[PDB]
Ligand binder design. Sequence first.
Ligand SMILES: CCN(CC)C(=O)c1cc(C)no1
Lengths: 412, 412
Amino acid sequence: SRRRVVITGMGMLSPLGLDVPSSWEGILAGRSGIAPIEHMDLSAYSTRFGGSVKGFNVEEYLSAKEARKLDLFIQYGLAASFQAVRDSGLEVTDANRERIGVSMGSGIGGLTNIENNCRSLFEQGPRRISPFFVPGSIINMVSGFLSIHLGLQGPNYALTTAQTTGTHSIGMAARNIAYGEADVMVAGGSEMAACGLGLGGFGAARALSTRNDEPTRASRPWDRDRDGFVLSDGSGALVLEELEHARARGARIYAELVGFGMSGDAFHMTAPPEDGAGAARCMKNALRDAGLDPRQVDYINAHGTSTPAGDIAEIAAVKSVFGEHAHALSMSSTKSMTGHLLGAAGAVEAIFSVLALRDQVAPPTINLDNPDEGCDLDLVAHEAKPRKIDVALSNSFGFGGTNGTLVFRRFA
Amino acid sequence: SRRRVVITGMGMLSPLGLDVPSSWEGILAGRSGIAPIEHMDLSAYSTRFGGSVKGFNVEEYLSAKEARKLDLFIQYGLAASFQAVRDSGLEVTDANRERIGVSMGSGIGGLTNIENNCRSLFEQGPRRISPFFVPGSIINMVSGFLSIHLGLQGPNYALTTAQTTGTHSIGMAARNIAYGEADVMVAGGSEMAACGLGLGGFGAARALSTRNDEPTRASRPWDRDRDGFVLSDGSGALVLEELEHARARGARIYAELVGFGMSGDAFHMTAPPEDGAGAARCMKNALRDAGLDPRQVDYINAHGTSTPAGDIAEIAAVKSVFGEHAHALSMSSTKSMTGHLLGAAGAVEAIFSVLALRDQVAPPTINLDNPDEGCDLDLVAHEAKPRKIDVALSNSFGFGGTNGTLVFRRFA
Ligand SMILES: CCN(CC)C(=O)c1cc(C)no1
């Protein structure tokens, strides 16, 4: 047997906001966080826009001196984590610190630091590389810094599964608690891949929208005029907690995490199979894990990246899994508003799935002006839809064909 | 309920060889894999040597057209993975492909490729960034490419926990099998951080030995004249398999994985605590997980990096965990010969621990000419020691205070 895992705290930086409630207000209003990227000469680039975090003040979290040691993606991960831990009300003590761990990940890690240190290396030579280049750039330093700052001695690790990172981080942290290796985990992901290297690297694969004239209309999941994903920055963290532990201290419980699925497509380095067979296996594994029938799902937060092949693969996968229930659930892509936060996508979208449960509302897929061929599900086009939601899924389908699904259920 | 996990296949690239038997021959003969680096000009660097993989032929594994797309860390991880799967005798079929996954990790991943593309970006422009920049560099793509080549549809992920990566990858993969999420996992790690940012960045932290004039003597764990770690490249992969699945197909079983521990130090971003308190918590977790009396431990493959603080912290931790039995077990650092493969260290060292069990021999700590203050355990100085080994423990410690321990034992 297995213990129950609940969500007691959430934290976020996104293109919509510097916290969860500001971000969520944007989501339910259909607001875009996408804009031309500033303080960068993007003249030579085919994409000049994305989802930046606006007005982030790291000195609310760290001293200037500690922040100078860390890449932006680590700053963002620590901000969401500190928010989530504050939101949980949890008191770390000598009696529980060995039972509290961290799994905060990233898909691409420290590109901004790699750029700035490459500048020094190329121009001046290796003796100008920062002493903090390695520890301030490696993906496990959100978990590392958070554990040092809060005195967490539980399991300490970091996943990196490209665009699936946040989903896998949360699911695997839930397993840690369910199987008794921890009582509390801080889990999620963070990403800062604006930089030239993110825009240039994805741009070279022609993976990005190039709708430079109308950045807010670029991310248009399942719309016939979509032309690839929009790159976005930020972070999501959840406090996952064993249910009896949460009840004993009088925690506020947002929702229960009942299911976690994983699969591999074993198909292609970057593209999904046309029928989303892997995504279907992963959703079926998550529902089996939750002991739920597909007919019990009310709301899906899609991966919904605005890539032609990805978006159609998900429709096929959902039709395959859900059969005569596929039209009754509501499925939306919040990436229509946030863009694609890569390894943090699954983290912020797990939060939006939990808030869909709290508020009984399916967030919109904005920009869905002309659904493409076969995109005839309830994709919540344009405007948020109040509805009954007992069970919400969140999907992430990333490079290497790596798939993750989380199942959340209302708690009372 | 929790299933038993055995080792049925192993694969490796190291500074001592292009497979496991050749590497292990070097280990038992006390041979150094460390030499001046030939693949780039290091005259401006304070460290000009390391553990390179010599004579690697990627066309033993993959077409030249595919290999040109992939950072060396991916090529090394695939080579070790392919060797491990072949060594296992396992046949992937429609009946089992959903139950076989992969967890191959890296500390830094494709830094060579990111550096080369950053040079293109800065000197020329984004138009010269490779289309394969992202899928040829990011850490999850060992697991990704391996799954595509062999048709593995089970859990597909990657850890990145700095120098603890290979140990965490193997332990977490064992938990997948133990808890019924998979029947077979390919798990381990790969690293190739020997580029200007890697050598420069560890150099700027003054973390590396600067013994340029005698590279084979540079790595000297617990020696009073040690002056930092030696940077090394390669990969380890193991096929982990549920016991009854291995028995059912008549697999050759090398050893059983009986224990896994993690802990965070919660001490410092890069320094280990002097008393080894986090390492001790991690080993005690692993020994309890294995249902063992600490006196059952015969052999410890130490982290043993040849840093002043790391090496003495490990003595303190072993004395704290094992008490008077600390004087009866044998503990060695194979990094004395291989150097520090960073995210691959725990993977190659897990393999060396399993071969210590197969061959009933403790590998030597070479270069241990003058053991430092308090370094008065059996550290198998200079020469391999034939001895009874029923239980072997492999330790890793990393940036962020992240600790892993694996416990292996002979299978009958
Ligand atoms: C054109 C050469 N090939 C196919 C063998 C490749 O580059 C290749 C194989 C996989 C997997 N991804 O890409």
